[PDB]
Amino acid sequence: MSSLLNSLLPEYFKPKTNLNINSSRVQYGFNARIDMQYEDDSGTRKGSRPNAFMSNTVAFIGNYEGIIVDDIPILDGLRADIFDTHGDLDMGLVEDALSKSTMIRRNVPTYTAYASELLYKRNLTSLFYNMLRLYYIKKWGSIKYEKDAIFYDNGHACLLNRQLFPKSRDASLESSLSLPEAEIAMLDPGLEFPEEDVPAILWHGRVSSRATCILGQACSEFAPLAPFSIAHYSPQLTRKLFVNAPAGIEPSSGRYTHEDVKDAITILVSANQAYTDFEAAYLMLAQTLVSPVPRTAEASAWFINAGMVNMPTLSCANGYYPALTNVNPYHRLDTWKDTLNHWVAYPDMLFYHSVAMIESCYVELGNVARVSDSDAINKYTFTELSVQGRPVMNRGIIVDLTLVAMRTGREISLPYPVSCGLTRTDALLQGTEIHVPVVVKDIDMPQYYNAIDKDVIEGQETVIKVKQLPPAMYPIYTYGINTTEFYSDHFEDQVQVEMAPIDNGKAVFNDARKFSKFMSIMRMMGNDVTATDLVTGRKVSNWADNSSGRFLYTDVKYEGQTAFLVDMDTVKARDHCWVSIVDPNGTMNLSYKMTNFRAAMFSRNKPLYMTGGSVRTIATGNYRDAAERLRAMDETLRLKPFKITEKLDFRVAAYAIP
Amino acid sequence: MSSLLNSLLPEYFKPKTNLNINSSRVQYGFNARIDMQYEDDSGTRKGSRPNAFMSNTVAFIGNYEGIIVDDIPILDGLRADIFDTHGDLDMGLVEDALSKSTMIRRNVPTYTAYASELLYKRNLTSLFYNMLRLYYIKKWGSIKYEKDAIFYDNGHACLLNRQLFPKSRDASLESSLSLPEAEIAMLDPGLEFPEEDVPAILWHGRVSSRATCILGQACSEFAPLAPFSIAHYSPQLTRKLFVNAPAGIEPSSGRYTHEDVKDAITILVSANQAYTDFEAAYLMLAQTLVSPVPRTAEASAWFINAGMVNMPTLSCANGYYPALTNVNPYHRLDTWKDTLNHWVAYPDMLFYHSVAMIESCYVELGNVARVSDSDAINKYTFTELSVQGRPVMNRGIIVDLTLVAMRTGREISLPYPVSCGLTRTDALLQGTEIHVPVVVKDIDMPQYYNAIDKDVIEGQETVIKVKQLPPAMYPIYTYGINTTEFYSDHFEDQVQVEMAPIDNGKAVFNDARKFSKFMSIMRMMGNDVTATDLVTGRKVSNWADNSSGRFLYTDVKYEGQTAFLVDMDTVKARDHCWVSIVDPNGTMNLSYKMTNFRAAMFSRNKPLYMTGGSVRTIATGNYRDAAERLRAMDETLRLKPFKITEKLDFRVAAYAIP
Amino acid sequence: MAPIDNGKAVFNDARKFSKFMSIMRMMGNDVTATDLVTGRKVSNWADNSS
């Protein structure tokens, strides 16, 4: 659904068509003007950062594994005559429709008997999904993956690509897959009895030399070398695929460009009348196009074990019954062609729709992981109460759409209760300790991180014990639309730390809430604060991120009693464009204000600019008003004359309109 | 945009068609009559300057470099039916448009897929840019650049063309470039898949033997030997260029006249309907064509670092799909063929439009440089507040047209937000003193200029320091259209200043404004006064520039606060009218009137006379046969002007919204 | 003062120069001005009573 994913984008964000991606890492964000203030009994110290960049790093790598599951049939496409008043295939009108058609008379009785089983095999989501992945593999084919590269680095702990993804050879995305071609046979119209467990599709005119090569590779096993997101492992959809094309199927060309895959999709959707099938495949790919680079070192627990992708079995019986598909189809919603029409016009817009969906999910799974099991709406039972339909199993797209509904605070409506795609809530529901590997840089690591060893020499491979999952992404596109006090994503905020002159700089935060806001605002001001817990004896640093520049309470890496000693004569100025706290006395009052917002994207430590035309909000009415218009100007070549007009020179001629 | 740049010229001046330029340097100015009237405590004196020549100097020498960048598509020339009710390109109607205009309907699905990807990147501005440069290389192909010539010469200091332009030799303009030829192949109709990264253009009848050689050289690399403005380094546009000509193309001749390039441009625009693409290239050349000769030695800091010319990527899909270009083209403005009709009639008029543009930019940057970096409108954030469109980036022409709006004080509007051309604000946007290399002519040079070596000898090559960039040009064409206090370019003005007490033979001027008014009066009377800056200990002189007969405060060459000790005993008498007095007494009143303006141009120390007939006006009205003004003010670029609000400091300038 | 000036301020007026130098001494700051015309020096700390 293009419509619901479009509304997630911010108001200030004005996207263009083309986006020239030339790397496997993008820092999307915005530039804002922060007017910071520090008030005290001595006086006020004002600062101003005119261009403050708040970013979330997003990569094109992520371990996924496809499995073939059984899903509901999508009945949108079949002629409206055979359907009854309630909206189910009234068998008796099917036998009537087949009898009054251009079918062979000896096949009518035997084909009608099979109809009861074969007409309820309508799900082309798996085919469209694979054909969409082939489009983006050939478009962004020049992106590279190095084996010994830095997945994450925060100064203390480092995590390499070798650690998370073993059995991984370095190669380009184009050179990753070597897809073998499945057989594309021609359906004989005079076949005695239809062959079930072999799908048959429709086609307009002649199957081109390149269309054979695309359909051949789409219905085949994906066995990748490099762990890419749009080239993950998928099982063999089918062995053989029939195509009811009276004009013969040309043999396989071998080569094809990304423009030829768009040609193949547009013919397949139009012939089969499968637009709702495409809408399902569009939302599936939106989840599993890009995966987020973790905010903290201990936020890598989400991507340790491979999340399963639920691909519904390829099943289509249109080739055997050409009569039942015509120009008057049955559809539930009137805006059922909107998702395809959006993709054909603006293919590269999927990148923006993808980051909008994963940012919405991973933000909400952040503040869902911090609720006790003894509650009404908890970790296990947040999907059941929200869903008001009848899906087969609460997995895939249902779990991701219900998280988006919680974030935006609106009602998401789909025409069919389809349960296909990636399932994210895997590591959460387990409710056990996860052992993430790490290579150390400094020697004073295991004070900060909950490490397995207490003394570790530099360059050693250690393990961190993560119990509660910290947030993987900070809200950026969904900044101050549905604000919570955990993230504290306000435009205006203030904190009041109360100290007396008798205290020699040392302040104890009994409250946990205002400790979080103090440590966060001090980092905007470019000050390196290092607090020490009095009960346990561990240490926390506000500088625990190089992207957002905020301090969340989950950076403590421990749930206990709150007694944080901060010594305010060991505060060090780290960044540029900073206010100085030289020697405070009395009550401190910190405050900031974010005024304006400008969309910015970075890649390879350089600005990535959006190019091409101005993207519009395509509606169903905007095309069918031109159908209402029809260009009703009678196609008659009316040539109008020009009267020559003489003036002073007479050498040169001058023509007038009347 | 002819009508825009034509408005910048003064109301009294109307230039003739032809101009035989026969040098690399042209003075332009006017011969005005000044009627001064003096009054002080001693008495009254009345005089009259009968003939006074105020002029700038402009040259054909400027170091520039080309970069190929991706910009917006210009959707002008495509048929009106493919566009919907709003100003948006619908792919639903492209499928219909291509379907109705063919008998072979097998190719419609393939044609639509490729067309959707190519239409959002169509731009012929870079091709017309090179074709225009080839026209002027052949026409003015007898201009000599000598390496051991003078660039600036005052009397104390001197800059040679060895400095500012190393890696250069002595050559004529025709001898500078030795262009190779790209392959101009013929597109046979029947080819089904458009070859990627090769543009295809339409043509009228047979491609002439001469037309081949021009298109071949226009696409090739430019590698100059001598630094020339219209022969600057440009990257290779394309390798191949298809031409859908019904009659086959002829082989390349090798030689062509400047007249043959006009025939090539006129055909290429008419066939492709690329009138708005030409308008972009016309404005883009108006910036580059000429460069200023600096007013003082400090104003050479602008032209050290090579400014980047943003040339858009060459792409076009008219040759493949000639159905999309028909007899009813889509245009936003009704005056969309005025710029080509102006150039084809009067080619040599571009010289006057270029001088008008570069003057307006370099005059207003004189004020922007003096703005403090702690206000709403400053050097960093003046373009962003002005623009009211959605370009790719605030670069090239958008920066230049913003400065023209600030000069004239009128709202400038283009149909498409194009960001292509020279960016000047590079030396300005950096907090670093610039090291201008100079030659010592007189032994007393270190007293005047801020030199590194305080002791020098006639012939030594030293370096001078420039912190704040002074004005490179004085207002001549834009004289009195809007008068600032800094320049003081009034027709009628009454200057009042109080003379400081002359103790021994020296008068102390503590205030900054009073000192500016005093030396401004004494210059108009024609008295060469020399003062000593007390803080620095360097000698200032009101006779700094001889060409423009006025005193600017930037001639002091010291940003900050100071007090001046004026030498009243050594007041020389260079130019004496009857008004001219040596001994001022009490409150000095000078009231002057300027009348009888007449434009005059000098080239190689002789008068340069305009030849040919009188320019008759070509211009189209807002409506041809259009009923309702469908505003469509969403995509169109608009540039809002800023008015200078004078304040007490006088050294600092400030902008406000009118 | 403007940021373009690197701390250096010239007092054209005599009245406000006296008040600046006096209030800076209440605040306990040793300022040393230099006259541009003559070339002599003045110090605000020229008394230990008032």
Swiss-Prot record, chains A, B:
InterPro entries the UniProt entry points to: Major_coat_LA-virus, Major_coat_LA-virus_sf
Cellular compartments annotated: Virion
Gene Ontology CC terms, in alphabetical order: viral capsid
Name the record gives this protein: Major capsid protein
Pfam families with a match to the protein in the record: LA-virus_coat
Predominant place of localization: virion
Biological process per Gene Ontology, one example term: viral translational frameshifting
Assigned keywords, A-Z: Capsid protein, RNA-binding, Virion
Protein family: Belongs to the totivirus major capsid protein family.
Record-level Gene Ontology MF annotations: RNA binding
Functional summary from the UniProt entry: Capsid protein self-assembles to form an icosahedral capsid with a T=2 symmetry, about 40 nm in diameter, and consisting of 60 capsid proteins asymmetric dimers. The capsid encapsulates the genomic dsRNA and the polymerase and remains intact following cell entry to protect the dsRNA from degradation and to prevent unfavorable antiviral responses in the host cell during all the replication cycle of the virus. Nascent transcripts are transcribed within the structural confines of the virion and are extruded into the cytoplasm.
SUPFAM superfamilies linked: L-A virus major coat protein (SSF82856)
Organism: Saccharomyces cerevisiae virus L-BC (ScV-L-BC)
Gene3D superfamilies xrefs: Major capsid protein
Highest taxon in the source lineage: Viruses
